[PDB]
Amino acid sequence: TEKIICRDVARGYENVPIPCVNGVDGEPCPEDYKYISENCETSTMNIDRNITHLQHCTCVDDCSSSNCLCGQLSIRCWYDKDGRLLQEFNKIEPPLIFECNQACSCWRNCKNRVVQSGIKVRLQLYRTAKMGWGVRALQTIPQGTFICEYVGELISDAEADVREDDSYLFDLDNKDGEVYCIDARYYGNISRFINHLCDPNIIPVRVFMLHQDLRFPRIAFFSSRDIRTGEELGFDYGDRFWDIKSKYFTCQCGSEKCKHSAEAIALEQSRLA
Amino acid sequence: TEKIICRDVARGYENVPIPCVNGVDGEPCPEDYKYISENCETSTMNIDRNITHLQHCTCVDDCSSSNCLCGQLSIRCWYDKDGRLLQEFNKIEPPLIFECNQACSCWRNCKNRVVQSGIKVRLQLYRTAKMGWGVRALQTIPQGTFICEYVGELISDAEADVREDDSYLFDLDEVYCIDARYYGNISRFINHLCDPNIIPVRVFMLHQDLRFPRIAFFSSRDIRTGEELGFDYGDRFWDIKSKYFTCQCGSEKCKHSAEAIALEQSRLA
Ligand SMILES: C[S@@+](CC[C@H](N)C(=O)[O-])C[C@H]1O[C@@H](n2cnc3c(N)ncnc32)[C@H](O)[C@@H]1O
Ligand SMILES: C[S@@+](CC[C@H](N)C(=O)[O-])C[C@H]1O[C@@H](n2cnc3c(N)ncnc32)[C@H](O)[C@@H]1O
Ligand SMILES: CNc1cc(C)nc(Nc2ccc(OC)c(C3=CCNCCC3)c2)n1
Ligand SMILES: CNc1cc(C)nc(Nc2ccc(OC)c(C3=CCNCCC3)c2)n1
Ligand SMILES: [Zn+2]
Ligand SMILES: [Zn+2]
Ligand SMILES: [Zn+2]
Ligand SMILES: [Zn+2]
Ligand SMILES: [Zn+2]
Ligand SMILES: [Zn+2]
Ligand SMILES: [Zn+2]
Ligand SMILES: [Zn+2]
């Protein structure tokens, strides 16, 4: 039987509480980590926070025009009037998003500040059947809605390379130079509990807000389709993760489209010869 | 004969709107600065944002216990149940206040997060009689209430020493400064009073880089509606600006007026 174990795993560090339940086994509100709502550093990253380096807009409306420079650096501004991704949004090739910032002319409440406004939808940390902890929606979520940000600790590839647990890494794809990661292992928000789905229902988008240091995009998940209450959430972890993790365990998403089940895995070894 | 010029000079960045009114002359909503709710940088200040260098507490309560480490770092926690300073607060030389942080065990709603929770009282930017713009209250403000932070651009004393205008400099105790000239919030418009109803306090929140305390204003006594806010700018400012102009605070205790500046000029010779 199900029961509210933690009333709010975010200790009210979010716009809404995110409670945790377990109706599958006897594991408690996990506490092998620290909840944070915003990214953190351990080493010196020296994010460029130079207010003059900020590409801003001069809009004096609600930034709903196409003349918003902030909403040009991403071709179009990709948010509708209700702060959803355009139905025509490039869901496979997600461009960089530059939200309005503190150098802009617009008001804090313009139409180009979705991600920076924090979680809005009601989420729940819950015990899955076969994947441990997972996240699910306690409400329908229209396609294109912002769910939550992938928050954790900022580290270099050289740091990631030598960390015991690689279970909670997230790659920040940068065109040039050195590469960086978010490790949600020791520090993280709700999103650290999102599982991999072979048939995903959210997508990550690299976003820029209070700063535009291309080394460190913030990662925001939006719903790639309508989501029915109670439905588990999950993005595609991609092959990097699976190539490493397969020999240790097997996908359990269950989707017939499953590309990483013990069955589909062995089918390709069988297809080999 | 008073007009409302900006609905909110903070462009909706504060918890509340801060409107501007002019009942004196024909000067409009000031617009030769950028309004920001949080301190900004131009050049790198290399603040220490390392979460492990954060001294945290491990309370499970609302941090009311005398056992909250954060509280102790400040001698004790100086906030009452409603977030106001204690009547027994050192108003002359106030201690640094370490608020709870993101590494603390406590909840975001604990008793030790006043300043980080933003402006609560209703303020208004208005045109004074002889002091240009000023900030006044729209409500009574109980003593020890948190008002606003002095927000601006962090600069070294080397940088400050060669800034054209030194009118929006606020000093921290390596020397660094907040210059609210090109970037600032409502506090950039608080005038100087010889009878100051607010005091600065150095605070730490998301980080504990001691070079960079954030500056919070609290009422030093009760404040009636309409009453103008103002803090003693200190003698550094006046020993510079005296020869340029003189204090118009209007106080009977005023110590920088034309009268006073001449009274001590001759009270000597
Ligand atoms: C970032 S964590 C997600 C939260 C995790 N379920 C937990 O309870 O901590 C990812 C780890 O959860 C498990 N996991 C996530 N998605 C899975 C999936 N689709 N199938 C099987 N295990 C999965 C694996 O142990 C994986 O290394
Ligand atoms: C930090 S600004 C205060 C905002 C200023 N009233 C304005 O209109 O922008 C400080 C400047 O305001 C004026 N000022 C502030 N306090 C004053 C006082 N007590 N008497 C006269 N002028 C004052 C002087 O021009 C001073 O250099
Ligand atoms: C270990 N060193 C590095 C270095 C870099 C640049 N990226 C990564 N990324 C990485 C590696 C392994 C992973 O799983 C085994 C993952 C993922 C972890 C779970 N979160 C979803 C993304 C895949 C990411 N790791
Ligand atoms: C110009 N260079 C420097 C360097 C340093 C370390 N401090 C300062 N502080 C300073 C100088 C002049 C001031 O007024 C003329 C002020 C003040 C400005 C207005 N705000 C009230 C505090 C006094 C501060 N200035
Ligand atoms: Zn705009
Ligand atoms: Zn903008
Ligand atoms: Zn905008
Ligand atoms: Zn699968
Ligand atoms: Zn505490
Ligand atoms: Zn604390
Ligand atoms: Zn606390
Ligand atoms: Zn005076």
From Swiss-Prot, chain A:
Coiled coil stretches, renumbered: none
Chain residues that bind Zn(2+) 2: C57, C70, C100, C104
Residues engaged in binding Zn(2+) 1: C57, C59, C63, C68
Binding locations of Zn(2+) 4: C198, C251, C253, C258
SET domain boundaries: 121-238
Domain of life: Eukaryota
Sequence segments annotated as region (Interaction with histone H3): 157-176, 237-240
Residues reported in the UniProt entry to bind Zn(2+) 3: C63, C100, C106, C110
Tissue: Expressed in all tissues examined, with high levels in fetal liver, thymus, lymph node, spleen and peripheral blood leukocytes and lower level in bone marrow.
Pre-SET domain location: 55-118
List of residues binding S-adenosyl-L-methionine: M131, G132, W133, Y168, N195, H196, Q252
Domain Post-SET span(s) in chain numbering: 247-263
Localisation: Nucleus; Chromosome
Free-text note on domains in this protein's UniProt record: The SET domain mediates interaction with WIZ.
Record-stated family: Belongs to the class V-like SAM-binding methyltransferase superfamily. Histone-lysine methyltransferase family. Suvar3-9 subfamily.
Function: Histone methyltransferase that specifically mono- and dimethylates 'Lys-9' of histone H3 (H3K9me1 and H3K9me2, respectively) in euchromatin. H3K9me represents a specific tag for epigenetic transcriptional repression by recruiting HP1 proteins to methylated histones. Also mediates monomethylation of 'Lys-56' of histone H3 (H3K56me1) in G1 phase, leading to promote interaction between histone H3 and PCNA and regulating DNA replication. Also weakly methylates 'Lys-27' of histone H3 (H3K27me).
Subunit structure, as described in the record: Heterodimer; heterodimerizes with EHMT1/GLP. Interacts with GFI1B and WIZ. Part of the E2F6.com-1 complex in G0 phase composed of E2F6, MGA, MAX, TFDP1, CBX3, BAT8, EHMT1, RING1, RNF2, MBLR, L3MBTL2 and YAF2. Part of a complex composed of TRIM28, HDAC1, HDAC2 and EHMT2. Interacts with UHRF1. Interacts with CDYL. Interacts with REST only in the presence of CDYL. Part of a complex containing at least CDYL, REST, WIZ, SETB1, EHMT1 and EHMT2. Interacts with PRDM9 and CDYL; interaction only takes place when PRDM9 is bound to hotspot DNA. Interacts with SMYD5.
Protein name per its UniProtKB record: Histone-lysine N-methyltransferase EHMT2
Organism of provenance: Homo sapiens (Human)
Portion of the full sequence shown: 918 to 1190 of 1210
